[PDB]
Structure 1
């Protein structure tokens, strides 16, 4: 399948090269997989989700995304225009209030929630979780990411936005999950991407068009926008049969565009997520 005049990041993770605008992909498109967006919530009523999205948890007084962040990240995963995995099932978990603030202990609660709940869902092709959030190093936050991953969920986490080595941030520094940095449409590291040997992969994160609340769209920027490209990609690769929740971060790295970003500080991977469909 081909989707012309696509947001640049969907074209990128289907290209070897920058500078084009079609998103080339296999039509199975994540059918039979499940992606949990653990964030401010998802405006499931957005027609771009077409009935595939459900809130299933909150730790606040409403499950609604009253911020838009969770809805945008979820759209990149799996909205019909703006998504990687256009036919995946989306499940929301609201661990952030309507300003973007979550206490750690609640974010932990969300995470163990997914390891349990996946067992309440129909996900024959595999389960992913997408965490576009974080704060300073915590062993506990990191332990809750290793548990979620160990429970057979592909876990994708934002490396962070301080232009700093990510080993000091959580859940990014955790080893066993898939820590995602951000790039731009000219294959530069985005100016705000954390970096450091704990990163596994880079995805598109600067001027990412996606869904927003009210039924609407916007473009924003962050390792948060990069993260759901890798989550959605992993859902897409499960569904096909290329990899598994426990193997997907390694498979994506193995199949990435290798060398191609400029400003990878020394010691940071120079790997860019790629679906290997068109070549």
Structure 2
């Protein structure tokens, strides 16, 4: 399938080269997979989600996304126009308040929630969790991310936006999950992207157009935007039968575009998420 005039990041995910604008992907499109977006919530009524999004948990007075961040990330995972996996089922878990903040104890509870809640959902092709959030190093936060992964969920987490080594941030520094840095449309490391040995992969993260609250759209930047590209890619590849929750991060690294990014510090992987789809 071909989506013309796609956001640059979608085109990038299906291309050996930067500078194109059509997204190519197998029409299965993540059908039968599920992606949890653990964030500020999801505006599930947005036409772009086509009834495939729902809130399943909140720790606050509402499950509504009063911020936009979670709706943007969910749109990159699976919205019809802005999403990588256009037929996945999206589940929102609101661990962040409408200012985008959240206590680590709530974030941990949300991760353990997903590990159990997947047993209440129909996801025959597999389960992914996208975590566009983080703060300073915490062994407890990393351990929660490790449990979620161990339970059979492909966990993708943002590297962070500190232009620093992600070893000092969580859950970015947990080795067993998929830590995602950000790149721009010219295949440069995004200026804010964290780096380091703990990164597994880069995805598009500068000037990413996606859904927003109020039935709108906007372009924003962050490793929060790169993470859902990788989460949606995992769901898509799992639906295709090419990999599993336990092996998807490694498979994405195996099949990534190699050596294409500039300003990658020595010791950080030079790997850019790529669906290797041949139309």
Q: What is the CA distance between 1:80 and its match in structure 2?
A: 0.4
- The aligned runs of 1:76-155 (5 Å cut-off) are 76-155=76-155
CA distance in 2, matches of 1:278, 1:123: 26
Q: What is the CA distance between 1:172 and its match in structure 2?
A: 0.2
1:109-143 Cα shifts (integer Å, max 9, x gaps)? 00000000000000000000000000000000000
**Are the aligned partners of 1:58 and 1:93 in contact in 2 as well (CA < 8 Å)?**
yes
Aligned length: 279
CA distance in 1, matches of 2:30, 2:230: 13
TM-score (norm 1): 1.00
Q: What is the CA distance between 1:160 and its match in structure 2?
A: 0.2
CA distance in 1, matches of 2:278, 2:15: 7
CA distance in 1, matches of 2:163, 2:190: 9
**Are the aligned partners of 1:137 and 1:169 in contact in 2 as well (CA < 8 Å)?**
yes
Moved over 2 A (4+): none
**Are the aligned partners of 1:83 and 1:232 in contact in 2 as well (CA < 8 Å)?**
yes
Q: Residue 236 of structure 1 aligns with which residue?
A: 236
1:163-187 Cα shifts (integer Å, max 9, x gaps)? 0000000000000000000000000
- Give 3-state SS (helix, strand or coil) of 1:129's partner: strand
CA distance in 2, matches of 1:5, 1:164: 34
- Give 3-state SS (helix, strand or coil) of 2:274's partner: coil
Q: What is the CA distance between 1:20 and its match in structure 2?
A: 0.3
CA distance in 2, matches of 1:86, 1:170: 29
**Are the aligned partners of 1:15 and 1:278 in contact in 2 as well (CA < 8 Å)?**
no
Q: What is the CA distance between 1:26 and its match in structure 2?
A: 0.3
CA distance in 2, matches of 1:147, 1:64: 27
**Are the aligned partners of 1:137 and 1:170 in contact in 2 as well (CA < 8 Å)?**
yes
CA distance in 1, matches of 2:190, 2:20: 19
- Give 3-state SS (helix, strand or coil) of 2:218's partner: strand
1:12-52 Cα shifts (integer Å, max 9, x gaps)? 00000000000000000000000000000000000100000
Does 1:181 find its partner at 2:181? yes
CA distance in 2, matches of 1:190, 1:3: 25
**Are the aligned partners of 1:38 and 1:94 in contact in 2 as well (CA < 8 Å)?**
yes
Q: What is the CA distance between 1:278 and its match in structure 2?
A: 2.8
TM-score (norm 2): 1.00
CA distance in 2, matches of 1:254, 1:209: 27
1:195-240 Cα shifts (integer Å, max 9, x gaps)? 0000000000000000000000000000000000000000000000
CA distance in 2, matches of 1:219, 1:236: 23
